[PDB]
């Protein structure tokens, strides 16, 4: 896999793809 | 954190995987 | 606003949109 | 869970907020 | 809900989520 | 180009892509 | 309407342009 | 307008809701 | 159609919409 | 990581995410 | 093909890499 | 190439169509 540059909703999409059925938590700073 | 890292720098899928439940 | 089916990546995109900086958890297993 | 609430059934954006931190 | 920073297609996605069955109009400047 | 099913947010994303600066309306009720 | 034209049935990008302003 | 506001500044869902049909 | 400003995954979405069943190739520099 | 259904634009978004700078081909006809 | 592998059936991100250049 | 052109400048759907299989 390649390194990623992901901002905004793109990161969430990436988390979704990566974690599948496990889900994930999205925890921005501040 | 990861949300900032991936946007201001880069991050890997493997780093992302740490955020799965 | 409205009630709609929100599935998969669209669901997490909506969570991103609603929660933003608070962050969220997506835990499909419950 | 969220999938039942929002995907299988329908939910509002308010109900979506249930899953924010 | 949180405030949004939405450019490009992200705004349209947001309008879609917000307006549901009502639909919406997307009217950029110029 | 092609003909395809375009639904939901994908539909409005396509409208954004086709209309861009002209803007568009998405009016699912007709 | 657009949903019938493009989602339920299929449409081209040209037909999509019908819904631009 | 809203398209520019949300991208150059911020906007709220409530502002967005004004653009629903 | 309008001209496009597409970065990142947005380009791929655009290619997807444009090429439909034909598919496409995505070939960034470097 | 996980195995999931990845279809349509979501499929090519995943390919973008996995391949990135290598690029990819999306060839649904095979 | 990819659609069979990943959409109709399921695939992993590794299998997705089969379609990179 | 097209990936850079569309992001740093603009590109058209017609240019994109060249990248279909
Ligand atoms: Cl879908
Ligand atoms: Cl973006
Ligand atoms: Zn989708
Ligand atoms: Zn984006």
I28 φ/ψ angles, rounded to the nearest 5 degrees: -65, 155
Is the separation of the CB atoms in E2 and A8 below 8 Å? no
Both tokens assigned to I11: 């380009």
Q: Could you identify the residue written with the tokens 């954190």?
A: B1
Which pair of tokens denotes residue A5? 């540059």
Q: How many CB atoms lie within 10 A of CB L7?
A: 17
Helices (H) and strands (E) in chain I, counts: 1, 1
Whether H and J touch, i.e. at least 3 CB pairs below 8 A, reads as: no
Give the method used. X-ray
* Chains E–F, number of C-beta pairs less than 8 Å apart: 46
Q: Is D16:C18 a contact under the CB 8 Å cutoff?
A: yes
Give long-range contacts, CB 8 A cutoff, 24+ apart: G12-17.
G12/F1, G12/F2, G12/F3, G13/F1, G13/F2, G13/F14, G13/F18, G13/I1, G13/I17, G13/I18, G13/L13, G14/F1, G15/F3, G16/F6, G16/F14, G16/F15, G16/F18, G16/F19, G17/F18, G17/F19, G17/I1
Q: Residue K14 in contact with residue J1, Cβ under 8 Å?
A: yes
Using the Cβ of J14 and the Cβ atoms of chain I, whether some distance falls under 8 Å is answered with no
User: Which helix (H) or strand (E) is C25 found in, with range?
Assistant: strand C24-26
The ligand that comes nearest to the alpha carbon of residue I10 is 4
Contacts with K4 (C-beta within 8 Å, 6 or more apart), sequence order: J30
Q: Using a CB-CB distance cutoff of 8 angstroms, which residues of chain A are in contact with residue E10?
A: 8-9
Q: Residue A7 C-alpha to ligand 2 middle, in angstroms?
A: 7
* Ligand 2 centroid, distance to E30 Cα (angstroms): 21
E16: β partners: none
Distance, in Å, from the CA atom of A10 to the CA atom of F12, rounded to the nearest integer, reads 18
CA distance J21 to chain B (A): 13
J21 reaches I (C-beta below 8 A): yes
Residues after which chain L has a gap (C–N > 2.5 Å): none
Q: Write out chain I residues lying below 8 Å of E9, CB-based.
A: 10, 13
**Do the Cβ atoms of B13 and A1 come closer than 8 Å?**
yes
F4 in L contact zone (CB under 8 Å): no
Distance CA L11, CA L14 (A): 8
To probe the interface with A, which of C6, C7, C8, C9 has the most A CB atoms within 10 Å?
A: C9
The Cα-based distances of C21 to A5, E2, E17 in angstroms read 19, 7, 18
Residues 6+ apart with CB under 8 A from J7: K3, K6, K7
Q: Where are the alpha helices (DSSP H) in J1-30?
A: 8-19
* Separation of first and last alpha carbons in chain D: 15
Domain boundaries, chain I: 1-30
Contacts of I7 in chain J (CB under 8 A): none
Distance between CA H4 and CA F11 in Å, rounded? 22
- Return all residues near L12 (Cβ < 8 A) that are at least 6 apart: I1, I3, I4
For this experimental structure, what is the resolution in angstroms?
Answer: 1.5
- If contacts are CB pairs under 8 Å, which of residues 1-21 in chain L contact chain I? 1-4, 6-7, 9-14, 16-17, 19-21
Specify whether the CB–CB gap between I20 and F1 falls below 8 A: yes
């Amino acid at each position: 896999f390649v390194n990623q540059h992901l901002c905004g909703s793109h990161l969430v999409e990436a988390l979704y793809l990566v974690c599948g059925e496990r889900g994930f938590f999205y925890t921005p700073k501040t | 954190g990861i949300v900032e890292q991936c946007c201001t720098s880069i991050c890997s899928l493997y780093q992302l995987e740490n955020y799965c439940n």
